[PDB]
Amino acid sequence: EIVLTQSPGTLSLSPGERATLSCRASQTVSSTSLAWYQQKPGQAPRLLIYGASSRATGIPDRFSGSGSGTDFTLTISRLEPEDFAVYYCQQHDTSLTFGGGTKVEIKRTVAAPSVFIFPPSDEQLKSGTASVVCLLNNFYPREAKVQWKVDNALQSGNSQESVTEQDSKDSTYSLSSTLTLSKADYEKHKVYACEVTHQGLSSPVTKSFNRGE
Amino acid sequence: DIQMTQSPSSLSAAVGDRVTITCRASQSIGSYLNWYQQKPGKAPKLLIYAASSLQSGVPSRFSGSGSGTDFTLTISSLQPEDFAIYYCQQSYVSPTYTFGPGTKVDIKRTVAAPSVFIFPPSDEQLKSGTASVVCLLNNFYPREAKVQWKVDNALQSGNSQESVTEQDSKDSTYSLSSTLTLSKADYEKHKVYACEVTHQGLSSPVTKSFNRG
Amino acid sequence: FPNITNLCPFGEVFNATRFASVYAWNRKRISNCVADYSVLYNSASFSTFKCYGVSPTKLNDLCFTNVYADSFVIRGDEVRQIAPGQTGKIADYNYKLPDDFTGCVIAWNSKNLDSKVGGNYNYLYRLFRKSNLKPFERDISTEIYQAGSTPCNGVEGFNCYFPLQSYGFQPTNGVGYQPYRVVVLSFELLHAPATVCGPKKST
Amino acid sequence: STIEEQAKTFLDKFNHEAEDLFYQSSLASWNYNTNITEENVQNMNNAGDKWSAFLKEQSTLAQMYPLQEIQNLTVKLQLQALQQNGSSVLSEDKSKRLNTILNTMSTIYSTGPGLNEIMANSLDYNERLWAWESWRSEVGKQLRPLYEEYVVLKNEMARANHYEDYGDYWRGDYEVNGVDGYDYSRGQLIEDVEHTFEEIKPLYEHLHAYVRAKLMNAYPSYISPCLPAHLLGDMWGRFWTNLYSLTVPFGQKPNIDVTDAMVDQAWDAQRIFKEAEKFFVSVGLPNMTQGFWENSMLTDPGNVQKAVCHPTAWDLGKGDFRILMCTKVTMDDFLTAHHEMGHIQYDMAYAAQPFLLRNGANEGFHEAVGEIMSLSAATPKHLKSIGLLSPDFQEDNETEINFLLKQALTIVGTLPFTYMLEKWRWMVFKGEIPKDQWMKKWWEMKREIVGVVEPVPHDETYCDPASLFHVSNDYSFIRYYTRTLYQFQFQEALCQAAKHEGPLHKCDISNSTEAGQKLFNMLRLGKSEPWTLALENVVGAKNMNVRPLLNYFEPLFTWLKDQNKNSFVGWSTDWSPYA
Amino acid sequence: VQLVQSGAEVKKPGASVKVSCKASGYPFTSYGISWVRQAPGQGLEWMGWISTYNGNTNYAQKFQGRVTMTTDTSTTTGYMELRRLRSDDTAVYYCARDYTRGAWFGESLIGGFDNWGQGTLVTVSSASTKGPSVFPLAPSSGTAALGCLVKDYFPEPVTVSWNSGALTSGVHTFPAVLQSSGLYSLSSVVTVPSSSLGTQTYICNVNHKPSNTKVDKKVEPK
Amino acid sequence: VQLVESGGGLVQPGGSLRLSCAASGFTFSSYDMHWVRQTTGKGLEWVSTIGTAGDTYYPDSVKGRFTISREDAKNSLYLQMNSLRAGDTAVYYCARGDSSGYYYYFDYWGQGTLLTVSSASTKGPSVFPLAPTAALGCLVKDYFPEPVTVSWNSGALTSGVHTFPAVLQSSGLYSLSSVVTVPSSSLGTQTYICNVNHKPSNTKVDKKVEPK
Ligand SMILES: *[C@@H]1O[C@H](CO[C@@H]2O[C@@H](C)[C@@H](O)[C@@H](O)[C@@H]2O)[C@@H](O[C@@H]2O[C@H](CO)[C@@H](O[C@@H]3O[C@H](CO[C@H]4O[C@H](CO[C@@H]5O[C@H](CO)[C@@H](O)[C@H](O)[C@@H]5O)[C@@H](O)[C@H](O)[C@@H]4O)[C@@H](O)[C@H](O)[C@@H]3O)[C@H](O)[C@H]2NC(C)=O)[C@H](O)[C@H]1NC(C)=O
Ligand SMILES: *[C@@H]1O[C@H](CO)[C@@H](O)[C@H](O)[C@H]1NC(C)=O
Ligand SMILES: *[C@@H]1O[C@H](CO)[C@@H](O)[C@H](O)[C@H]1NC(C)=O
Ligand SMILES: *[C@@H]1O[C@H](CO)[C@@H](O)[C@H](O)[C@H]1NC(C)=O
Ligand SMILES: *[C@@H]1O[C@H](CO)[C@@H](O)[C@H](O)[C@H]1NC(C)=O
Ligand SMILES: [Cl-]
Ligand SMILES: [Cl-]
Ligand SMILES: [Cl-]
Ligand SMILES: [Cl-]
Ligand SMILES: [Cl-]
Ligand SMILES: [Cl-]
Ligand SMILES: [Cl-]
Ligand SMILES: [Cl-]
Ligand code: NA
Ligand code: NA
Ligand code: NA
Ligand code: NA
Ligand SMILES: [Zn+2]
């Protein structure tokens, strides 16, 4: 078994700059049996480099294949707007394995999220479930701490987060946290708050509401 | 590569004679051998292919034999037209096909005396300031012939230049040209000009002359 | 070509990840297919492209019983030896072609594939034998070469050598010492129905 | 299975091993020489030890093939170089002692160019006397009692190797035995050098007469109507190069230097070497290998790494050829580039030969090939051909003499010194000079041969010979006499092939295939055929000559005879500066 | 040259799925086909390799006892049947033209997976086809934001638009989230001028083709 | 079946030129095509091959310098030559290739075009008549480079015609003579014109030779 380790696996670079992606094997892989792949969000993967260096047919000048032994690299001389995607290395020295991938992200300025709280609708409460939504709107970077405080009790194993792909204009992220709770469990509490900590914020920001107000 | 060698290098036979030309290959080349014919100012003509097979449009007079290392071209009965350099070519190693050095096939015939002619420089040439005087020896055999110039009586050399034709394809004789080059000043200092010819077909040295009038 | 066509695996042979060494030359047999020679023509890779018995311009035109593709790695100065009637170290003791050989020989510089900083010593060429190889013989024996009068049964020492020596391929080698991958396509002319033929529009 | 067939099956096995292992060490050597670190030496020495240990392993195995059982002359030449435990014949204790003496002498030579700068630039008699005397008084007394046991043990080594003396051991680097009409005994080296030196005398005496005449205009109170030893332009009086500062024929006429024109067109290193490359293509020699243009170090690599920087050509093996020369925009470096590429062309030629035969024909062949490239690239015709000298610029009858005399002070001034030094060392080894006359006869020879007298009377506690590098470090010195003669022998024969018009000093070998072909016929062989046969493949003669050297300085020799019609020609061996 | 795949297929655990991959534009018999699967929001995972010539095959260890691959030269179509399905098998499955292993001799080649299919989404869950319970996320208290919760649907996907494609400025639709029920839930939000919060009517157009459920809902500001 | 060469002339060293071969008489598309050069010292050297399947072949001394082109449509063969050396001065022939079995051969050949690689400048010839069984001729004096073609009465007279090989003069230029032997019964009762053509300078000269 050979394992290809791609670090950092999520690379933040400004457009037009050099991108140096890394693929490290557990065991020496012959240069003639290692390849690179591009995958833009929601699309199929395409072959960039094969035999460590050799470009595929419909590949621009930007992409340069390098590396030998265990430490291989994929070089993008200039990051064009279409280049910000996910990249996988692959070996067939022994069997066939892929790497973990590396998302090349657009590096934006620090942007704080606009936080919005949403009470469960009365229609949903008729259906005997309650889902309170905490919304983070347009922020960078991606990492954010979202905590659910119900009354004062910190919520753990009932929350679920979902985050969009990077914006196609301002290059920001938006995150949605949804706290699902049964009707019976919902009406046992008064205060429903979501606290958000992010690099861009001057202080943790709390949005809250009283149950039936 | 495969080096080709031909023997003999030079050859002289009379009309009617059987001529035997040999070709040697660097290594064993089965029957991949081609015989060619090249006349003085023409391109090679394919005579024999596959070492033995006779090309169409070629007199059955021509013959090819041999396999392995040694090959043989035979002119059944030499004719005056057959004056040529004959090349052998190997068809084993492609696309690097190689030729032999060629064998000159000269023709022996009866002795023929040269028809001696002398020519004055044109009035058009005296405009340039140089005088070129030409002496022609027409249709003679054999090739050996010595030519000398005389200005009034003074013998001059180092200012003349000789040129001799290849053997004719019909009568198989040679022709010679001798060009005496003077200045306009040197042409006006002398009156009568002559070129002397000596040949083994002439019982005595023969002269042709002209005056500057 | 139609998609349903059965082309010959020239891509597998020529584009194999790793070649065997000349001493243990690898033989792949090609039969019952359509031979596309367009892949080989005009290639910008090949440094040596020679054919023996047939013109390469008429490869599409010919049918054969079988096609044998031999593959191995050599050094630049020794590419000469893979030919009929050639002599040398690898020609005598590793791989010999007949003098009546009907086929083609193709070679390309694999500097950046088979060389390595520190040296790649994975390609073994035989250096000694008691006898020259017959055409299309393969010797993989590990018997100690007896060059002296005294026997040295199963032991290396003085006048006794291990027959197989390792090529040293460095990236900074000279042209003649750089590794070259070689494919020898041998065409068979046996008295049996031919199987490998060129394009349908040719033959 | 014959001893001949066994020797073959051993040597080709050796050829395989020696190819890779030398290359591995060659890379390790290259690493340090381009990038001086304390891990590169550890990698260099560890590879040099593995190379050295392999040689002494194979030589031992090679001994079991007797030379008298070998008819094949090329296999005989191969083993001859391999099977040699030459110095490792003496007893373990004496062998270790000889090593320690060689260690001591070499170290104390270095430990003990400041004085050289004084002996090159100073015009003070006393300061140059101080620098000359103290050097021979310091180490010259230290080396004396150790040079005796050096001579004792080196003869012991030589006589145990069936050589008559240790001088005969060095004379064995010119020996050829077993080729009909090309054989050369060790004794013929002496006679040939002596015969050629006789023809040098007329030219050298007039050079001595002119240099004397110019030095008495500089030192009017420290001259003789022999010359002082500390007023010859260097430490020992080897090169009269630094005397051109005074002994200039015409201080009016300009010194030809196209350093200005090189920085006018901003000639970078990559162009300089390409201009050298095309020079060799102009004679029919191939252009540099692909690996050459990749791996060569032709400039100063900043300060991130420092290198040896001393211009050196490189034969790493396995077809690897490189140049190590942190080049500058100078004419000196322009010519040195041609010189060092000349070395490579030699290396590239005989690369097809078996490993052990890859070398110069003799010890003075390789360097002679390099210098003829510098001579042809310094010619006004070539300097106008490439375009460093203006097409309108022409030579005169005075700029010609200035150049030739500058060349003469370096070339002609060395030969009488080299012969004197080696004739001394030869007679010392065979014991024709007693130990209590080692210093007296050295100065007797200096007087009679070179025309050089000691400024201070020397005791037998001194050793003035061992003031020089080659003497103390134990190196043969005759190779400096031979290579000089070879140069012009190579030049003359090439210029006849290039159909050169005029004197030999104006010769440019460019744009002549017959010249390149003539040279390549020799270069391809190397240490494969007798050096007599090698020399013949160029000149047509089997022996050394000085008449090619005379032809180079013919217009100078006539000028020297003209200006020394009313001068002191010759030297009397009686006068001393303290008398 | 193009590779075309079956289309999204949804099956229960324990059942069998068979994805088809049609090849055109190249000699089918020369090149081999290999299969790669990708779990949602995860990396590529090699499954196996099939020779179009002789039918020899190499699978990974994780799939060795389940997966079976076949080819048909007459149709130029390669199949991939994975039996004994599990919940973790929920992935998008790709067929690709192979230049890593030769079809004839089964030896490694200098290349990779050059041509790729479009992929087939294969969902494996205990869940059955169910329409999304759409609930409004009312704007509470400049650029006030209102949303639309699309809770409990199976299988994916759902398409959501604001004002039937009239409002595209400042809209964010979050990817679905797999729930322990096996069903999926989604959120869609939009930033809106507070001046236009009372004037305009904002409708959330949820389309779920799998269940044939179209639901549009008002978002009442309160 | 015919092959006709074109293009050959004077080129400066390090320069470039193209050669053209016009084919006729056969289905050009179905036959392989070759260029072959001929030198005084080394003889016949193969320089390029082009196949029926668009395949090209070269020697190492050629590849990357010369490129062979083919027009199936126009029955034409081309050879684009770059980086020309002095050692490229040769007579270039275009020749067909055919096989009778496995055995290959060059059945039909061209006429030959002379490429000459020199730094020396081009110059047209100065033609002069040679005033008169009697003989007369034309002197083609001072020209560079080769070749020069002379014909008599636009190719109506061939019988007693001799065209001597050109001789390089001391000046560095070429000089040539052409003569014809004619019955004295035809002097004045038939006029003779030599058709001198020097392609490398586009100097076509037709001059009349008559009794002085
Ligand atoms: C061994 O593999 C080779 C590499 O192939 C590719 O990658 C593999 C991993 C695999 O996925 C393959 O399917 C894939 O093709 C094979 O070579 C390919 O073979 C093709 C013919 O079958 C050949 O095609 C012709 O394409 C020409 C355009 O090619 C493209 O490549 C260009 C790279 O190269 C250049 O060289 C030329 C001069 O020779 C020069 O003009 C260019 O400037 C350039 O430097 C690239 O620049 C283009 O953008 C384009 O992508 C076309 O002109 C012609 O009409 C043909 O149709 C391919 O050229 C060739 N690919 C390469 C790069 O090698 C090879 O066949 C395999 N061996 C066998 C025996 O099968
Ligand atoms: C110089 O030597 C060191 C040895 O440790 C090596 O690692 C380094 O690569 C070298 N430096 C350069 C610039 O090549
Ligand atoms: C010596 O033997 C070698 C083979 O090892 C051979 O090349 C050579 O011809 C022989 N020497 C001569 C010159 O006879
Ligand atoms: C050597 O120089 C010649 C002429 O400039 C050039 O054609 C050639 O490419 C060079 N050598 C090689 C084989 O690279
Ligand atoms: C040789 O002659 C050429 C002109 O033919 C000239 O350009 C060149 O300078 C000469 N060679 C050299 C490098 O001296
Ligand atoms: Cl693509
Ligand atoms: Cl290395
Ligand atoms: Cl040997
Ligand atoms: Cl060997
Ligand atoms: Cl992953
Ligand atoms: Cl056209
Ligand atoms: Cl025909
Ligand atoms: Cl003439
Ligand atoms: Na070729
Ligand atoms: Na081994
Ligand atoms: Na056209
Ligand atoms: Na025919
Ligand atoms: Zn040197």
Author numbering:
A (entry chain B), B (entry chain L): 1 to 213
C (entry chain R): 329 to 531
D (entry chain E): 19 to 130, 146 to 258, 261 to 614
E (entry chain A): 2 to 142, 148 to 228
F (entry chain H): 2 to 133, 142 to 221
The study reports:
Of special interest is the evolution of the SARS-CoV-2 surface protein, spike (S), which is responsible for viral entry via its interaction with the human angiotensin-converting enzyme 2 (hACE2) receptor on host cells. First, the RBM mediates viral entry (Shang et al., 2020; Walls et al., 2020; Wrapp et al., 2020b) and therefore must maintain sufficient affinity to engage the entry receptor hACE2. Second, it is a major target of neutralizing antibodies (Piccoli et al., 2020; Robbiani et al., 2020; Rogers et al., 2020; Wec et al., 2020) and so would be a primary location for the emergence of immune escape mutations. Here, we demonstrate that the immunodominant SARS-CoV-2 spike (S) receptor binding motif (RBM) is a highly variable region of S and provide epidemiological, clinical, and molecular characterization of a prevalent, sentinel RBM mutation, N439K.
